Amino acid sequence: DCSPGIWQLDCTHLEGKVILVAVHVASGYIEAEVIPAETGQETAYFLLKLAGRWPVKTVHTDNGSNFTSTTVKAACWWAGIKQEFGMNKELKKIIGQVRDQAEHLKTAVQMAVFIHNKKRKGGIGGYSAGERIVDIIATDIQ
Amino acid sequence: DCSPGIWQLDCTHLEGKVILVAVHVASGYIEAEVIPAETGQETAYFLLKLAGRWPVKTVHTDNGSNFTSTTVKAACWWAGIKQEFGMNKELKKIIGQVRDQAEHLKTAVQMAVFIHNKKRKGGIGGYSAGERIVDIIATDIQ
Protein backbone atom coordinates (compact mmCIF):
# COMPACT_ATOMS: atom_id res chain seq x y z
CA ASP A 1 0.00 0.00 0.00
CA CYS A 2 2.48 2.62 1.20
CA SER A 3 6.27 2.93 1.50
CA PRO A 4 7.99 -0.08 3.20
CA GLY A 5 9.10 2.03 6.15
CA ILE A 6 5.62 3.17 7.13
CA TRP A 7 3.89 1.85 10.24
CA GLN A 8 0.62 2.56 12.05
CA LEU A 9 0.59 2.33 15.85
CA ASP A 10 -2.46 2.49 18.14
CA CYS A 11 -3.71 1.18 21.47
CA THR A 12 -6.72 -1.09 21.87
CA HIS A 13 -8.46 -1.92 25.12
CA LEU A 14 -9.63 -5.36 26.13
CA GLU A 15 -10.49 -6.94 29.48
CA GLY A 16 -9.40 -3.75 31.20
CA LYS A 17 -5.88 -4.17 29.81
CA VAL A 18 -4.34 -2.28 26.90
CA ILE A 19 -3.05 -3.92 23.72
CA LEU A 20 -0.42 -1.97 21.80
CA VAL A 21 -0.78 -2.77 18.08
CA ALA A 22 1.68 -1.99 15.29
CA VAL A 23 0.71 -2.61 11.67
CA HIS A 24 3.09 -2.51 8.70
CA VAL A 25 0.78 -0.55 6.41
CA ALA A 26 2.11 -2.02 3.13
CA SER A 27 1.90 -5.69 4.13
CA GLY A 28 -0.75 -6.03 6.82
CA TYR A 29 1.85 -7.54 9.16
CA ILE A 30 0.89 -7.02 12.80
CA GLU A 31 3.05 -6.91 15.95
CA ALA A 32 1.40 -6.57 19.37
CA GLU A 33 2.04 -6.33 23.10
CA VAL A 34 -0.34 -6.31 26.08
CA ILE A 35 0.52 -3.57 28.59
CA PRO A 36 -0.94 -2.28 31.89
CA ALA A 37 -1.75 1.26 30.71
CA GLU A 38 -1.18 3.71 27.86
CA THR A 39 1.96 5.58 28.88
CA GLY A 40 4.60 7.32 26.79
CA GLN A 41 7.12 5.11 28.54
CA GLU A 42 5.48 1.97 27.12
CA THR A 43 4.99 3.50 23.68
CA ALA A 44 8.64 4.58 23.57
CA TYR A 45 9.81 1.10 24.60
CA PHE A 46 7.65 -0.56 21.94
CA LEU A 47 8.89 1.82 19.23
CA LEU A 48 12.50 0.99 20.09
CA LYS A 49 11.93 -2.76 19.76
CA LEU A 50 10.12 -2.27 16.45
CA ALA A 51 12.96 -0.06 15.19
CA GLY A 52 15.71 -2.57 15.93
CA ARG A 53 13.77 -5.25 14.07
CA TRP A 54 12.49 -3.52 10.92
CA PRO A 55 13.60 -0.39 9.00
CA VAL A 56 11.12 1.97 10.66
CA LYS A 57 11.12 5.42 9.05
CA THR A 58 7.70 6.89 9.85
CA VAL A 59 4.93 6.00 12.28
CA HIS A 60 1.37 7.25 12.16
CA THR A 61 -1.38 6.97 14.75
CA ASP A 62 -5.10 7.80 14.97
CA ASN A 63 -4.56 9.66 18.22
CA GLY A 64 -1.78 12.21 17.94
CA SER A 65 -1.60 12.79 21.69
CA ASN A 66 -0.09 9.29 21.71
CA PHE A 67 3.25 10.75 20.60
CA THR A 68 3.53 14.05 22.48
CA SER A 69 5.54 12.84 25.48
CA THR A 70 9.24 13.63 25.65
CA THR A 71 9.73 9.93 26.32
CA VAL A 72 8.29 9.05 22.89
CA LYS A 73 10.02 11.91 21.12
CA ALA A 74 13.28 10.71 22.74
CA ALA A 75 12.80 7.19 21.39
CA CYS A 76 11.96 8.49 17.93
CA TRP A 77 14.96 10.82 17.92
CA TRP A 78 17.45 8.11 18.88
CA ALA A 79 16.05 5.53 16.45
CA GLY A 80 15.68 8.04 13.62
CA ILE A 81 11.89 7.69 13.29
CA LYS A 82 9.76 10.64 12.12
CA GLN A 83 5.99 11.04 12.57
CA GLU A 84 2.98 10.66 10.25
CA PHE A 85 2.88 8.14 7.39
CA GLY A 86 5.91 9.35 5.29
CA MET A 87 -6.29 -4.78 11.53
CA ASN A 88 -7.56 -4.08 15.06
CA LYS A 89 -11.17 -5.24 14.55
CA GLU A 90 -10.17 -8.48 12.80
CA LEU A 91 -7.43 -9.08 15.38
CA LYS A 92 -9.95 -8.44 18.17
CA LYS A 93 -12.20 -11.04 16.50
CA ILE A 94 -9.45 -13.67 16.26
CA ILE A 95 -8.54 -12.98 19.90
CA GLY A 96 -12.19 -13.52 20.83
CA GLN A 97 -12.16 -16.79 18.92
CA VAL A 98 -8.93 -18.07 20.48
CA ARG A 99 -9.45 -16.70 24.02
CA ASP A 100 -10.73 -20.08 25.22
CA GLN A 101 -7.58 -21.99 24.28
CA ALA A 102 -5.39 -19.24 25.75
CA GLU A 103 -5.03 -19.11 29.53
CA HIS A 104 -4.42 -15.34 29.53
CA LEU A 105 -5.13 -12.35 27.31
CA LYS A 106 -1.39 -12.04 26.52
CA THR A 107 -1.32 -15.53 25.03
CA ALA A 108 -4.59 -15.05 23.13
CA VAL A 109 -3.19 -11.83 21.60
CA GLN A 110 0.02 -13.56 20.50
CA MET A 111 -2.02 -16.49 19.15
CA ALA A 112 -4.16 -13.98 17.19
CA VAL A 113 -1.04 -12.22 15.84
CA PHE A 114 0.40 -15.60 14.77
CA ILE A 115 -2.87 -16.56 13.08
CA HIS A 116 -3.25 -13.18 11.37
CA ASN A 117 0.36 -13.04 10.12
CA LYS A 118 0.28 -16.65 8.88
CA LYS A 119 -3.10 -16.67 7.10
CA ARG A 120 -2.32 -16.80 3.38
CA LYS A 121 -4.65 -14.67 1.27
CA GLY A 122 -6.50 -17.17 -0.91
CA GLY A 123 -6.05 -15.58 -4.31
CA ILE A 124 -3.51 -14.31 -6.85
CA GLY A 125 -0.06 -14.27 -5.28
CA GLY A 126 -1.58 -15.74 -2.14
CA TYR A 127 1.00 -14.72 0.43
CA SER A 128 0.57 -14.14 4.15
CA ALA A 129 1.19 -10.74 5.76
CA GLY A 130 4.25 -12.30 7.38
CA GLU A 131 5.62 -13.33 4.00
CA ARG A 132 4.70 -9.99 2.42
CA ILE A 133 6.60 -7.87 4.92
CA VAL A 134 9.77 -9.94 4.47
CA ASP A 135 9.49 -9.74 0.69
CA ILE A 136 8.65 -6.02 0.66
CA ILE A 137 11.66 -5.24 2.85
CA ALA A 138 13.89 -7.84 1.17
CA THR A 139 13.66 -5.89 -2.07
CA ASP A 140 15.91 -3.28 -0.35
CA ILE A 141 12.93 -0.91 -0.34
CA GLN A 142 12.79 0.23 3.30
CA ASP B 1 25.10 -20.78 8.84
CA CYS B 2 22.19 -23.17 9.42
CA SER B 3 18.65 -23.61 8.07
CA PRO B 4 16.54 -20.39 8.00
CA GLY B 5 14.10 -21.74 10.57
CA ILE B 6 16.71 -22.39 13.25
CA TRP B 7 16.94 -20.23 16.36
CA GLN B 8 19.00 -20.26 19.56
CA LEU B 9 17.35 -19.08 22.77
CA ASP B 10 19.04 -18.48 26.14
CA CYS B 11 18.75 -16.30 29.23
CA THR B 12 21.40 -13.83 30.34
CA HIS B 13 21.54 -12.10 33.71
CA LEU B 14 22.35 -8.45 34.23
CA GLU B 15 21.71 -6.03 37.09
CA GLY B 16 19.78 -8.75 38.88
CA LYS B 17 17.29 -8.90 36.01
CA VAL B 18 17.09 -11.56 33.30
CA ILE B 19 17.46 -10.85 29.59
CA LEU B 20 15.86 -13.38 27.25
CA VAL B 21 17.88 -13.52 24.02
CA ALA B 22 16.89 -15.12 20.72
CA VAL B 23 19.41 -15.37 17.88
CA HIS B 24 18.60 -16.36 14.30
CA VAL B 25 21.57 -18.68 13.85
CA ALA B 26 21.93 -18.18 10.08
CA SER B 27 21.90 -14.36 10.11
CA GLY B 28 23.08 -13.20 13.51
CA TYR B 29 19.81 -11.31 13.98
CA ILE B 30 19.01 -10.84 17.67
CA GLU B 31 15.67 -10.28 19.43
CA ALA B 32 15.59 -9.66 23.20
CA GLU B 33 13.35 -8.98 26.17
CA VAL B 34 14.13 -8.11 29.80
CA ILE B 35 12.08 -10.17 32.26
CA PRO B 36 11.83 -10.51 36.07
CA ALA B 37 12.86 -14.17 36.31
CA GLU B 38 13.49 -17.29 34.22
CA THR B 39 10.11 -19.03 34.16
CA GLY B 40 8.58 -21.40 31.64
CA GLN B 41 5.69 -18.97 31.45
CA GLU B 42 7.98 -16.20 30.17
CA THR B 43 9.86 -18.51 27.82
CA ALA B 44 6.57 -19.80 26.38
CA TYR B 45 5.28 -16.25 25.85
CA PHE B 46 8.50 -15.19 24.12
CA LEU B 47 8.46 -18.24 21.84
CA LEU B 48 4.91 -17.44 20.75
CA LYS B 49 5.79 -13.87 19.79
CA LEU B 50 8.85 -15.06 17.87
CA ALA B 51 6.75 -17.69 16.07
CA GLY B 52 4.11 -15.24 14.86
CA ARG B 53 6.84 -13.00 13.45
CA TRP B 54 9.28 -15.39 11.76
CA PRO B 55 8.95 -18.96 10.40
CA VAL B 56 10.29 -20.68 13.53
CA LYS B 57 10.80 -24.41 13.00
CA THR B 58 13.40 -25.43 15.59
CA VAL B 59 14.85 -23.79 18.69
CA HIS B 60 18.00 -24.81 20.49
CA THR B 61 19.32 -23.73 23.88
CA ASP B 62 22.50 -24.25 25.94
CA ASN B 63 20.45 -25.26 28.96
CA GLY B 64 17.94 -27.96 28.11
CA SER B 65 16.06 -27.59 31.40
CA ASN B 66 14.92 -24.30 29.85
CA PHE B 67 12.34 -26.18 27.78
CA THR B 68 11.06 -28.92 30.10
CA SER B 69 8.00 -27.11 31.47
CA THR B 70 4.57 -28.06 30.17
CA THR B 71 4.05 -24.35 29.60
CA VAL B 72 6.93 -24.27 27.07
CA LYS B 73 6.00 -27.58 25.50
CA ALA B 74 2.44 -26.21 25.13
CA ALA B 75 3.69 -23.12 23.30
CA CYS B 76 5.90 -25.20 21.03
CA TRP B 77 3.09 -27.64 20.27
CA TRP B 78 0.60 -24.93 19.30
CA ALA B 79 3.09 -22.96 17.19
CA GLY B 80 4.53 -26.08 15.55
CA ILE B 81 8.08 -25.59 16.87
CA LYS B 82 10.33 -28.60 17.56
CA GLN B 83 13.47 -28.65 19.73
CA GLU B 84 17.21 -28.68 18.99
CA PHE B 85 18.73 -26.97 15.95
CA GLY B 86 16.89 -28.85 13.09
CA MET B 87 25.85 -12.89 20.34
CA ASN B 88 25.36 -12.60 24.12
CA LYS B 89 28.89 -11.39 25.01
CA GLU B 90 28.97 -8.76 22.24
CA LEU B 91 25.41 -7.70 23.08
CA LYS B 92 26.38 -7.46 26.76
CA LYS B 93 29.29 -5.24 25.68
CA ILE B 94 27.10 -2.92 23.59
CA ILE B 95 24.62 -2.73 26.48
CA GLY B 96 27.49 -1.75 28.77
CA GLN B 97 28.52 0.93 26.30
CA VAL B 98 25.01 2.36 25.88
CA ARG B 99 23.81 1.96 29.49
CA ASP B 100 24.62 5.61 30.24
CA GLN B 101 22.35 7.02 27.54
CA ALA B 102 19.57 4.60 28.52
CA GLU B 103 17.55 5.41 31.64
CA HIS B 104 16.78 1.72 32.31
CA LEU B 105 18.23 -1.67 31.48
CA LYS B 106 15.22 -2.40 29.21
CA THR B 107 16.04 0.60 27.02
CA ALA B 108 19.77 -0.16 26.96
CA VAL B 109 19.02 -3.73 25.84
CA GLN B 110 16.74 -2.53 23.03
CA MET B 111 19.35 0.08 22.04
CA ALA B 112 21.98 -2.70 21.95
CA VAL B 113 19.68 -4.93 19.83
CA PHE B 114 19.09 -2.03 17.42
CA ILE B 115 22.82 -1.33 17.19
CA HIS B 116 23.71 -5.00 16.74
CA ASN B 117 21.04 -5.66 14.09
CA LYS B 118 21.88 -2.49 12.15
CA LYS B 119 25.70 -2.71 12.13
CA ARG B 120 26.67 -3.57 8.56
CA LYS B 121 29.57 -6.02 8.31
CA GLY B 122 32.34 -4.04 6.64
CA GLY B 123 33.36 -6.46 3.92
CA ILE B 124 32.15 -8.47 0.93
CA GLY B 125 28.37 -8.32 0.74
CA GLY B 126 28.42 -6.02 3.75
CA TYR B 127 24.90 -6.51 5.06
CA SER B 128 23.58 -6.12 8.60
CA ALA B 129 22.11 -9.03 10.55
CA GLY B 130 18.75 -7.30 10.19
CA GLU B 131 19.10 -7.24 6.41
CA ARG B 132 20.42 -10.81 6.30
CA ILE B 133 17.48 -12.35 8.14
CA VAL B 134 14.98 -10.65 5.82
CA ASP B 135 16.90 -11.78 2.74
CA ILE B 136 17.44 -15.33 4.03
CA ILE B 137 13.73 -15.71 4.76
CA ALA B 138 12.64 -13.76 1.67
CA THR B 139 14.18 -16.44 -0.52
CA ASP B 140 11.25 -18.67 0.61
CA ILE B 141 13.76 -20.77 2.55
CA GLN B 142 12.19 -20.95 6.02
Curated annotation (Swiss-Prot), chains A, B:
* Domain (Integrase catalytic): residue spans on this chain: 1-137
* Residues that bind Mg(2+) 3: 10, 62
Q: Which domain of life is it from?
A: Viruses
Its localization reads:
Virion; Host nucleus; Host cytoplasm
The residues the entry assigns to the signal sequence are: none
Entry's free-text remark on domains: The core domain contains the D-x(n)-D-x(35)-E motif, named for the phylogenetically conserved glutamic acid and aspartic acid residues and the invariant 35 amino acid spacing between the second and third acidic residues. Each acidic residue of the D,D(35)E motif is independently essential for the 3'-processing and strand transfer activities of purified integrase protein.
Q: How does it assemble?
A: Homotetramer; may further associate as a homohexadecamer. Part of the pre-integration complex (PIC) which is composed of viral genome, matrix protein, Vpr and integrase. Interacts with human SMARCB1/INI1 and human PSIP1/LEDGF isoform 1. Interacts with human KPNA3; this interaction might play a role in nuclear import of the pre-integration complex. Interacts with human NUP153; this interaction might play a role in nuclear import of the pre-integration complex.
> What is this protein's function?
Catalyzes viral DNA integration into the host chromosome, by performing a series of DNA cutting and joining reactions. This enzyme activity takes place after virion entry into a cell and reverse transcription of the RNA genome in dsDNA. The first step in the integration process is 3' processing. This step requires a complex comprising the viral genome, matrix protein, Vpr and integrase. This complex is called the pre-integration complex (PIC). The integrase protein removes 2 nucleotides from each 3' end of the viral DNA, leaving recessed CA OH's at the 3' ends.
**What's the protein name?**
Integrase
Encoding gene, per UniProt annotation: gag-pol
